[PDB]
Each structure stands twice: as C-alpha cells, then as structure tokens.
Design a protein around this ligand. Structure first.
Ligand SMILES: *C/C=C(C)/C=C/C=C(C)/C=C/C1=C(C)CCCC1(C)C
Length: 137
C-alpha cells in the first residue's frame, strides 16, 4: 500500500459516457476524449496525506487531502465540490463529493492499488462508472 509513483495508462473505459451524464455535449465529448484519454498521474503519499497531480498536454490538476478530512476540488467537468476520502480496505480509498453550488449528478471516485501493481481509478456519475487502469513508470 504505497500509492506513490508516476503512473501511466494501460486501460480506460466509459469516459465519454461519464461526460454525457455530466452534460458535456457531443462534439465537446468527442474532441475531449481524443486528447485527455492519456493523462499522466503523479502521486506522492505520506501516510494518509496525499498529493496528486493529474495532467494532460496543456492542463494540470492538483489535489491535496488527508484521509478523513474535508477538502475542495473539482468534478471531472470542472465544478467546485466538497470532498471527503475514506478507506474501504488496505489498498482502496473512496471519495464522496457534494456540489458547492447548484444541482447535478451524484459524483464520486475511488483509488485502488492491486497487488499486481496496477493503480485503478474509478469515477462515477450517477449510474455510470468510468475506469482508468495505470501501471508504474
Ligand atoms: C486518487 C486519484 C485521483 C483523485 C485522480 C483523479 C483524476 C481525475 C479526477 C481526472 C480527471 C480528468 C479530467 C478532469 C479531464 C481530463 C480527463 C481526466 C480523466 C484526466
């Protein structure tokens, strides 16, 4: 259970479907998936304090949290939400998100390290689950 490393993608699933539920319309979804279905992820872990950097070609997102401590970040479609992370096993954590403003689909994410050394990220919007699978560089 050391999440730390520089992670690269081997697999991704249902990302466009996720964006549809989030209300991103067609041309935008098609364009987006043709250059954001290969983001890089960097994690530095310090106990249950996490630093996560997620980057495409021209955009980067910085997430900082302690497990069990409320913080702020964005939904996938760039919307301000309150977040809370909890452990579900030794190698898996879960985040529940609430919008600061307005209404929208219920969103969440999970992070899991397999024993094979795969980092599995899921993002969920109502009934849709998008899964990204990473290995270490
Ligand atoms: C523990 C790992 C976490 C919290 C990683 C979360 C990653 C995302 C929320 C990625 C979001 C993306 C966008 C917001 C737009 C570009 C496509 C993604 C998947 C990189």
């Amino acid at each position: 259970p050391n999440f730390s490393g520089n992670w690269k993608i081997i697999r991704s699933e249902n990302f466009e479907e996720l964006l549809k539920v989030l209300g991103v319309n067609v041309m935008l979804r098609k364009i987006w998936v043709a250059a954001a279905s290969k983001p890089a992820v960097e994690i530095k872990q310090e106990g249950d304090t996490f630093y996560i950097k997620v980057s495409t070609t021209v955009w980067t997102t910085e997430i900082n949290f302690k497990v069990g401590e409320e913080f702020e970040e964005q939904t996938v479609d760039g919307r301000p939400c309150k977040s809370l992370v909890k452990w579900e096993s030794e190698n898996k954590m879960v985040c529940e998100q609430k919008l600061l403003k307005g209404e929208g689909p219920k969103t969440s994410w999970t992070k899991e390290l397999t024993n094979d050394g795969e980092l599995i990220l899921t993002m969920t919007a109502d009934d849709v689950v998008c899964t990204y699978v990473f290995v270490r560089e």
